[PDB]
A paper describes a structure:
Bloodgood and Sloboda have shown that the flagellar membrane glycoprotein 1B (FMG1B), an unusually large ≈4546 amino‐acid long molecule, constitutes a major part of the glycocalyx of C. reinhardtii, which localizes to the ciliary coat and is visible as a densely stained layer in electron microscopy sections. FMG1B is described as a mucin orthologue which lacks the major O‐glycosylation of mammalian mucins but is N‐glycosylated. The results find FMG1 to form a protective layer with adhesion‐regulative instead of adhesion‐conferring properties and an example of an undescribed class of mucins. In wild‐type cells, the ciliary membrane that surrounds the central axonemal structure is coated with a diffuse inner layer of low electron density and an outer, electron‐dense layer consisting entirely of FMG1.
Instead, we purified FMG1B from C. reinhardtii cilia by concanavalin A affinity chromatography and performed single particle cryoEM analysis. The resulting ≈3 Å structure of FMG1B revealed the molecule as a long, twisted chain of 34 individual globular subdomains of 109.6 ± 10.9 amino acids and one cysteine‐rich coiled domain. The individual subdomains fold into an Ig‐like fold with each two orthogonal beta‐sheets and one short alpha helix, which we call beta chunk repeats (BCR). We modeled the semi‐rigid structures composed of the chained BCRs to high confidence, while the flexible nature of the cysteine‐rich domain resulted in a lower local resolution density which, together with the absence of bulky, recognizable amino acids, could not be assigned confidently. The C‐terminus of FMG1B consists of an ≈100 amino‐acid long intrinsically disordered region (IDR) linker followed by a multi‐helix transmembrane domain (TMD). Due to the inherent flexibility of the linker region, no densities could be resolved for either the linker region or the TMD. Despite the high sequence variability between individual BCRs, every BCR contained a single highly conserved disulfide bridge as confirmed by MS‐assisted disulfide detection, while no disulfide bridges were detectable in the cysteine‐rich domain under our conditions. Interestingly, we observe protruding densities by cryoEM that cannot be explained by the primary peptide sequence. Strikingly, we find a near‐perfect correlation between the identified candidate sites and the unexplained electron densities. As such, we were able to directly confirm 25 glycosylation sites of FMG1B, which were mostly located to the 16 n‐terminal and the 9 c‐terminal BCRs, all of which were in proximity to each other on one side of the FMG1B molecule.
Numbering used by the authors: 29 to 379
């Protein structure tokens, strides 16, 4: 609390400070002042609330009407008595104000070979020209690390950036794995944040798989395709299954009970559960993981492994056909589940 540097800026309205000594402080709100590198003053009381957020960290949530700027600086204010080290020393104003610097936003693996990452700040992000085709440019922005910390040898191929969104596409050789993490490398000169740059974060972001497609496995069951190897509780109970996949009628009314049992699929990245849509049983059914899901995990059922994030919106259970049977020497008849429609001419070329 006399001279320190670091911090993690996670969103457009929240900061956190990293310090040397552990603390049990309850309040920090009125213990900081805001300037910039240009020396134009900012929020006198930048923060509305504080709580302990780590071994030594103090979270500092910005109040309304405040947005980040390059080289933002935060310094301890006068006569602050709530924040203290466990040694009994309250913070005093520092000779050099700490610099607020960013850290990447959330991440999710929408497709088995695409990684999408949001960013803490939605403007100013720029990179050296050639990032769209140079692995020396895109690949130097973020490091991909196993659970043990073994960085991967350029599993990426390209980077795509626009406003607050960023995207890194894997490769066939660089096949994805469960339980991996992504974090920035120290001093990387590629990714900027306006008139600033991005610096490695405290813990990184653990990648989570998700859902991609759904269909009818049998006449009364449904297959579910996943972007990573799946795992479910052994011989799970019906209640467990009903607490994961929220299932809604065509217009959006919920279905309290849809599944009787849930278990793995033909492949390690597939699942099969009871009931079906086929536009029977609802005529429009859709599936989606619940917001606060608990039990659908990848790699294993361990607590550390990532969860399956819910998709962007509910997936539509994709229908199939029932059977075909020869009747005459010039005709086959095919049963289709419940009514259907035709969108065009049924000429020989069309069929």
């Amino acid at each position: 609390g006399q001279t320190l540097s670091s911090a993690v800026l996670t969103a457009s309205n929240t900061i956190m400070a990293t310090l040397s000594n552990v603390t049990t402080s309850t309040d920090c709100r009125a213990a900081f002042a805001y300037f910039d590198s240009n020396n134009a003053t900012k929020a006198a009381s930048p923060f509305a609330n504080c709580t302990v957020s780590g071994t030594t960290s103090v979270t500092l949530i910005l109040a309304s009407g405040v947005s980040y700027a390059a080289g933002d600086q935060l310094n301890i204010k006068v006569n602050q008595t709530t924040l203290n080290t466990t040694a009994g020393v309250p913070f005093v104003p520092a000779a050099a104000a700490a610099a607020v610097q960013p850290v990447l936003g959330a991440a999710t693996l929408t497709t088995a070979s695409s990684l999408v990452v949001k960013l803490p700040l939605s403007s100013g992000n720029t990179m050296p020209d050639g990032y769209a085709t140079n692995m020396t440019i895109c690949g130097a922005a973020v490091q991909l690390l196993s659970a043990a910390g073994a960085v991967k040898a350029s599993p990426f191929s390209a980077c795509l950036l626009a406003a607050d969104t960023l995207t890194l596409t894997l490769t066939s050789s660089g096949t994805y794995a469960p339980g991996d993490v992504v974090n920035v490398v120290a001093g990387q000169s590629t990714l900027k944040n306006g008139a600033t740059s991005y610096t490695k974060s405290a813990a990184g972001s653990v990648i989570r798989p998700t859902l991609t497609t759904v269909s009818l496995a049998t006449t009364t069951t449904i297959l579910i395709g996943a972007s990573a190897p799946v795992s479910l509780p052994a011989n799970a109970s019906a209640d467990v299954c009903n607490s994961i996949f929220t299932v809604a009628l065509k217009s959006g009314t919920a279905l309290p009970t849809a599944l009787s049992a849930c278990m793995a699929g033909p492949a390690v990245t597939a699942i099969t559960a009871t009931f079906a849509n086929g536009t029977t049983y609802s005529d429009g059914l859709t599936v989606t993981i619940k917001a606060n899901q608990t039990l659908l995990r990848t790699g294993d059922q361990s607590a550390s492994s990532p969860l399956f994030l819910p998709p962007a919106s509910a997936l539509v259970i994709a229908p199939t056909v029932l059977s075909a049977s020869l009747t005459s020497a010039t005709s086959i008849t095919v049963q289709l589940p419940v009514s259907s429609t035709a969108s065009g001419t049924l000429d020989a070329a069309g069929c």
